[PDB]
Design an enzyme around this catalytic site. Structure first.
Site, short mmCIF file in Angstrom:
data_model
loop_
_atom_site.label_atom_id
_atom_site.label_comp_id
_atom_site.label_asym_id
_atom_site.label_seq_id
_atom_site.Cartn_x
_atom_site.Cartn_y
_atom_site.Cartn_z
N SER A 1 0.85 -1.23 0.00
CA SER A 1 0.00 0.00 0.00
C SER A 1 0.86 1.24 0.00
O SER A 1 1.88 1.29 0.71
CB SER A 1 -0.83 0.02 1.28
OG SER A 1 -1.59 -1.15 1.45
N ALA B 1 -0.43 -0.50 5.85
CA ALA B 1 -0.13 -1.44 6.92
C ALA B 1 1.26 -1.05 7.46
O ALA B 1 2.15 -0.73 6.70
CB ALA B 1 -0.17 -2.85 6.42
N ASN C 1 4.98 0.95 2.74
CA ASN C 1 5.22 -0.16 3.69
C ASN C 1 6.71 -0.18 4.13
O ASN C 1 7.23 -1.18 4.67
CB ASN C 1 4.74 -1.52 3.15
CG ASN C 1 3.29 -1.51 2.75
OD1 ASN C 1 2.96 -1.86 1.61
ND2 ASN C 1 2.39 -1.17 3.70
C1 LIG Z 1 -3.20 -3.81 2.22
C2 LIG Z 1 -2.55 -3.61 3.60
C3 LIG Z 1 -1.08 -3.24 3.45
O1 LIG Z 1 -0.74 -1.86 3.33
O2 LIG Z 1 -0.08 -4.19 3.74
C4 LIG Z 1 -3.24 -2.56 4.36
C5 LIG Z 1 -3.70 -2.82 5.65
C6 LIG Z 1 -4.37 -1.85 6.38
C7 LIG Z 1 -4.62 -0.63 5.80
C8 LIG Z 1 -4.19 -0.36 4.50
C9 LIG Z 1 -3.48 -1.32 3.79
#
Ligand SMILES: C[C@@H](C(=O)O)c1ccccc1
Ligand SMILES: [Ca+2]
Lengths: 557, 206
Positions: free
Chosen positions: A1, A69, A241
């Site tokens: 994300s 996330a 991330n």
């Molecule tokens: C898809 C996942 C991620 O970014 O790993 C996520 C989790 C929680 C909020 C946004 C994205």
């Protein structure tokens, strides 16, 4: 994300801008749900996964919020001590404590029902793996007991009107999640939310710890410790991330690292390239990052050093010159099946061989397999999620940086041979492999593009629609499942805020009994494909003027 | 009127709910959700609770067992039980609203039952707050915030110590799965601040 928040010092024709692309995979019907709420203290518009009460992506006209996330390490494993004489008990702090247990029965369609027991200790539920007469493993989450509080925190944050109020809610969200903030005034912010253990001194959180008591967590760390920033000097906040903050430790997953090689740098350059960005240019970062090969920037310099002194007619050299001319932005050929440039395939094959020759060879079987993926592997349906630099590649990067890596090379991944020799041999392999499939004329190589599939089975692998409801898109795009953008105080509009999103295939998943699909079953599908978007409305005035239907219910509780 | 809930959809079908109090507001959200995604939400409930096999058969028995072994329903139930009436009203309202549409569906299935239900051989039942909570628990907390490979990590370290010796083994584990890397691009710049803690990278718990 991914997510980029642009503040007042960097926003052109606006005071702030927020562009979010959460990558949950692709599904039909859509992974997220569009909703607006107006009353009982809320005034919001946006879209949210599985229609949770709280909108993970949205705004209230005053502030806007988003998520990625966090991948902090908020989970440890305690090795509990058992004995054959006290079945269902475990030693904790000098005493035999009875485990929690419950009976479950799986009813089965056209099959026999099966009963099984689930076990739990003070540390968490017991893992059905790695089990012995002496030991059983319990999974401890720092968020344990705060699941419902995290849902509410994500709901109440929608009511915040400033940084203070919003962080108060961010403090109550216990999962490891990056939250982002922006407002009409042009302020921006970021918080790596979540509960994290306050571990005993000496606790290496990459490895299990005894469950007998001495290694128990002391508690949880206070919110002061959660990485955060309000209005950074840089004038922007970018995440993909990657790591929140200097010296902050990542998830203990062996396949997960924050190192020199990180896809977030790709966003950083586009944002630092121009002093200010308009909303349209902020949106275009999706298209550009969507199509950006992520390995080219990391390994081109090494590739160039190894081939710098070869003669013009060396094919290894030609493959490198091909990459040197390339910006790394993949584009479809007019056939809708192949890529214009063969760069990714060159990289994929070269990287695969390099890992086999370095990281993989240094690691004992079969752990070695964990470091062999190039990060390009896929199926005919395409990636199930984002594309990233692989663990192996990240480790290889530290090694080709030589002295520029702060990571000691305890063992030479190149095992005594000069790096150039190894790089070259991997290029020899690449030329043999590719030249036999495509022939010897690189300029006409038409390599397979990745495609994208909106699956009828949800992430669990469970049908959430019939098989024929699956949709396909020719071009794979390394982007959010949905994308939304909120622009605050736009100078060219009469409202103090503008918002846009795209929820493909559509808002509705409904099909009547006779097979008639709903009006909004597929109307965002092409919009997703061409990096388009639709307006999100907030005000009663905007909503009334774009109404298509209305229903008024009367109920008392 | 405090009993009134107004639902307006825009040119994309996106619903806007207007209501006076908490319970009515989330009833409204719940209503429109059951209109838009009933099959998807039914199958999501089943996924988050481990009841897929009941309707899809033996290929999902292991799936179902795995889901149930990864959470404790009673603890989720007790959290809901501790909620203030305003916070409870969010979960109850949402569920109640879905229930209102679900009831019209099963009253007039000839026209309102999503086709998938016919295809897959069953009908939708009513929802409770526990169900809404677990949607979130099962697809956000367990999917994205429940990650560990510590058992595997220990096994790699073990194997490395065997191949390279104790000290070098450890050093190589620190090369492949470092605790921190100072060169990692960060979302927060070094001028702003840094993380106050340390952490041991020598396995001192053994
Ligand atoms: C898809 C996942 C991620 O970014 O790993 C996520 C989790 C929680 C909020 C946004 C994205
Ligand atoms: Ca851990």
């Amino acid at each position: 994300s991914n997510m980029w928040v642009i503040g007042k010092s960097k926003a052109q024709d606006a005071k702030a801008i927020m562009v979010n692309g959460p990558q949950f995979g692709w599904y039909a019907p859509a992974y997220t749900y569009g909703i607006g709420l107006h009353g009982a203290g809320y005034d919001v518009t946006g879209n949210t996964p599985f229609a949770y009460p709280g909108l993970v992506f949205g705004h209230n006209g005053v502030i806007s919020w988003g998520s990625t996330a966090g991948f902090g390490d908020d989970v440890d494993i305690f090795a509990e001590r058992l004995s054959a004489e006290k079945p269902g008990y475990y030693l904790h702090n000098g005493k035999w404590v009875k485990m929690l247990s419950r009976e479950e029965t799986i009813t089965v369609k056209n099959g026999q029902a099966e009963t099984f027991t689930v076990w739990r200790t003070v540390h968490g539920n017991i893992l059905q793996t790695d089990q012995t007469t002496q030991t059983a493993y319990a999974k401890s989450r720092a968020w344990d007991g705060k699941e419902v509080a995290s849902l509410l925190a994500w709901t109440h944050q929608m009511k915040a009107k400033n940084w203070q109020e919003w962080t108060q809610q961010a403090a109550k969200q216990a999962l490891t999640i990056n939250w982002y903030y922006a407002d009409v005034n042009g302020n921006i912010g970021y918080v790596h939310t979540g509960a994290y253990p306050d571990r005993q001194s000496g606790h290496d959180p990459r490895l299990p710890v005894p469950g007998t008591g001495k290694w128990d967590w002391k508690g949880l760390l206070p919110f002061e410790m959660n990485p955060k920033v309000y209005n950074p000097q840089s004038g922007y906040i970018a995440n993909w991330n990657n790591s929140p903050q200097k010296d902050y430790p990542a998830s203990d997953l062996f396949a997960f690292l924050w190192g020199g090689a990180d896809r977030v740098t790709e966003i950083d350059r586009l944002l630092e390239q121009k002093p200010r960005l308009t909303a349209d240019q902020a949106w275009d970062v999706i298209r550009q990052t969507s199509r950006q090969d992520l390995n080219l920037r990391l390994f081109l310099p090494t590739l160039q050093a190894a081939t710098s002194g070869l003669t013009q007619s060396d094919p290894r050299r030609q493959l490198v010159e091909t990459l040197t001319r390339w910006d790394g932005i993949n584009l479809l050929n007019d056939d809708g099946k192949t890529w214009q440039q063969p760069g990714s395939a060159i990289l994929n094959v070269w990287l695969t061989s390099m890992l086999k020759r370095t990281v993989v060879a240094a690691v004992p079987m079969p752990f070695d397999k964990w470091y062999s993926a190039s990060g390009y592997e896929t199926t005919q349906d395409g990636p199930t999620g984002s594309l990233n630099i692989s663990v192996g590649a990240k480790i290889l990067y530290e090694a080709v940086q030589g002295d520029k890596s702060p990571i000691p090379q305890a063992v030479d991944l190149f095992a005594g041979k000069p790096q150039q020799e190894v790089v070259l041999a991997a290029l020899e392999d690449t030329w043999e492999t590719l030249s036999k499939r495509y022939g010897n004329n690189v300029s006409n190589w038409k390599t397979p593009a990745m495609a994208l599939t909106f699956r009828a089975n949800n992430f669990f692998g469970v049908p959430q629609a019939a098989a024929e409801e699956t949709r396909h898109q020719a071009e794979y795009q390394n982007r959010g499942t949905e994308n939304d953008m909120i622009v605050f105080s736009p100078t060219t509009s009469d409202r103090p805020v503008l918002a846009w999103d795209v929820v493909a295939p559509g808002q509705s998943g409904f099909i009547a009994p006779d097979g008639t699909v709903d009006k909004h079953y597929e109307d965002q599908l092409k919009m997703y494909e061409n990096f388009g978007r639709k307006s999100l409305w907030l005000t009663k005035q905007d909503v009334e003027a774009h109404k298509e239907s209305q229903e008024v219910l009367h109920v008392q509780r | 009127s405090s009993s009134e809930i107004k639902i307006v959809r825009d040119e994309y079908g996106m619903p806007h709910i207007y209501a006076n109090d908490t319970w009515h507001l989330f009833y409204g959200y719940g209503y429109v959700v059951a209109q838009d995604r009933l099959f998807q939400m039914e199958m999501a409930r089943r996924s988050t609770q481990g009841t897929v096999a009941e309707v899809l058969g033996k290929d999902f028995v292991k799936f179902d067992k795995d889901i149930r072994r990864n959470y404790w329903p009673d603890a989720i139930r007790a959290q809901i039980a501790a909620l203030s009436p305003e916070d409870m009203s969010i979960l109850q309202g949402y569920a109640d609203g879905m229930n209102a549409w679900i009831d019209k569906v099963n009253t007039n299935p000839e026209t309102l039952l999503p086709k998938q239900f016919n295809t897959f051989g069953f009908t939708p039942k009513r929802w409770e707050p526990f169900d809404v909570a677990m949607i979130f628990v099962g697809t956000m907390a367990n999917r994205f915030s429940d990650s560990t490979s510590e058992i595997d990590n220990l096994a790699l370290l073990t194997a490395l110590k065997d191949k390279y010796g104790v000290s070098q083994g450890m050093a190589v584990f620190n090369q492949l799965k470092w605790l921190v890397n100072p060169s990692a691009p960060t979302t927060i710049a070094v001028q702003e601040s840094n993380y106050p803690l340390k952490f041991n990278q020598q396995n001192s718990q053994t």
